Amino acid sequence: RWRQTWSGPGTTKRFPETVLARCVKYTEIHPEMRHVDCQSVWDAFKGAFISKHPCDITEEDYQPLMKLGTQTVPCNKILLWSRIKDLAHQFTQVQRDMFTLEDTLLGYLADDLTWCGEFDTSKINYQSCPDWRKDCSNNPVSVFWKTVSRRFAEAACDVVHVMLDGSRSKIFDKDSTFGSVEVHNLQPEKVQTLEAWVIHGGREDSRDLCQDPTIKELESIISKRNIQFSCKNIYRPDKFLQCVKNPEDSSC
Ligand SMILES: *[C@H]1O[C@H](OP(=O)(O)OCCc2ccccc2)[C@@H](O)[C@@H]1F
């Protein structure tokens, strides 16, 4: 009773109700997805992990959810991001013609949430869920993001943009979900260019972070997929967001 099963956070409280409400809200904000039956979405979501050992989840478990959440977003208007979620989302809230994963129904449902079941019972584990590193990688949360990120990267076309956190030790971390799943799923038949926006932090604007070794590593991988690579520095993300909000400002 004093022992917890896993190292990671348990299921977010009221996960069932939260997923259902987010579905209702999404279908309300976005009419093109209004055909979705939100109860059915939850059912299939639930079906992916309930009663399953939380170290034995597969992409196949999530397929019925993937089917119900079928959504075509303009393939040429996609924004990827690695480890800089906030600004990317803040960007798409203003620049409403562009989409991150979390601006899709499926991403929107799962964003910031944790969930897992218990092997061979109907219960949701509200106490602890597997940590990707300490416990096992094939857990309900990690496998969900892997599945959706693959499809999202596979649907991408034309010019794909990626926002990266220039203030990190590894600006392109080839171990991230961007690096390990998204990048290698950018199809050169569809995707002409990958353009990176490297977001600087604070008054650190003296360097061209597009010259960072990890960015050259990204350039190399992208080029070996027969995809053009472009990189821009964003020295002032504070002013960047403002210019996105009010493009009429003479300062940008
Ligand atoms: C698909 O995945 C992207 O997220 P990410 O920040 O690149 O990866 C998650 C963080 C991480 C970092 C190091 C090692 C493992 C995981 C998003 O653009 C999109 F939602």
Side-chain angles (χ1 to χ4, degrees), residues 2-252:
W2 53 93
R3 316 188 55 194
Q4 295 190 9
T5 308
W6 306 112
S7 289
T11 304
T12 311
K13 75 177 278 175
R14 300 181 53 86
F15 179 72
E17 297 90 342
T18 304
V19 171
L20 201 58
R22 282 176 169 202
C23 183
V24 175
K25 189 165 155 58
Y26 192 92
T27 56
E28 285 169 347
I29 316 157
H30 307 95
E32 80 273 358
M33 284 301 292
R34 198 181 160 261
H35 59 276
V36 155
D37 185 331
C38 282
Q39 185 63 56
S40 297
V41 169
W42 165 246
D43 283 3
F45 205 138
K46 182 170 72 159
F49 70 95
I50 276 283
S51 316
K52 295 185 195 309
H53 190 289
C55 289
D56 296 336
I57 316 300
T58 66
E59 298 197 26
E60 201 156 13
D61 293 325
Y62 281 102
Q63 188 57 29
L65 177 63
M66 290 312 102
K67 302 188 193 85
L68 288 175
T70 297
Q71 190 181 354
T72 310
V73 307
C75 66
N76 61 308
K77 299 290 189 193
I78 286 147
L79 181 72
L80 304 176
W81 57 268
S82 191
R83 301 210 76 163
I84 188 144
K85 184 157 98 180
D86 282 28
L87 187 75
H89 289 175
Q90 276 160 29
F91 185 80
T92 57
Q93 284 290 307
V94 187
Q95 202 73 77
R96 289 196 148 286
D97 61 344
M98 283 182 58
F99 282 71
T100 70
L101 176 54
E102 296 80 24
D103 296 312
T104 66
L105 169 67
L106 287 185
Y108 182 94
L109 301 174
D111 188 30
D112 288 331
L113 301 180
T114 296
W115 66 92
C116 63
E118 301 177 0
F119 177 80
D120 225 14
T121 78
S122 61
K123 304 291 131 74
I124 290 176
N125 191 339
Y126 286 110
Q127 188 168 62
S128 72
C129 288
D131 176 85
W132 168 63
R133 285 204 193 267
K134 286 188 94 142
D135 300 314
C136 60
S137 52
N138 297 319
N139 63 74
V141 166
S142 306
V143 170
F144 167 91
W145 286 115
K146 198 164 172 188
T147 309
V148 283
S149 297
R150 180 188 317 304
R151 296 157 71 77
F152 193 68
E154 288 183 319
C157 79
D158 204 14
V159 184
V160 188
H161 294 91
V162 61
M163 195 173 277
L164 307 161
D165 185 5
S167 65
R168 269 188 148 75
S169 201
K170 294 176 182 173
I171 307 168
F172 170 69
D173 181 348
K174 68 150 166 52
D175 277 349
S176 63
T177 310
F178 174 63
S180 67
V181 162
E182 288 157 24
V183 154
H184 104 262
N185 277 120
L186 294 171
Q187 302 185 20
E189 289 79 29
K190 276 177 147 102
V191 176
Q192 290 179 36
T193 312
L194 185 68
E195 178 162 274
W197 299 341
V198 181
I199 311 298
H200 295 244
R203 281 210 176 179
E204 295 283 321
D205 68 344
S206 72
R207 277 182 303 288
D208 176 4
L209 291 186
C210 295
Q211 291 308 307
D212 196 73
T214 71
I215 298 310
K216 283 298 201 287
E217 188 203 348
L218 175 65
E219 172 184 296
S220 181
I221 299 162
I222 284 295
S223 300
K224 282 179 158 50
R225 294 194 64 78
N226 201 3
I227 298 173
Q228 300 182 98
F229 183 79
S230 187
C231 179
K232 312 285 175 178
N233 288 280
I234 297 184
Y235 297 108
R236 292 270 280 272
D238 52 314
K239 273 270 174 168
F240 174 67
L241 262 194
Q242 283 166 34
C243 291
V244 171
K245 286 165 165 167
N246 321 263
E248 286 64 36
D249 196 323
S250 58
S251 285
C252 318

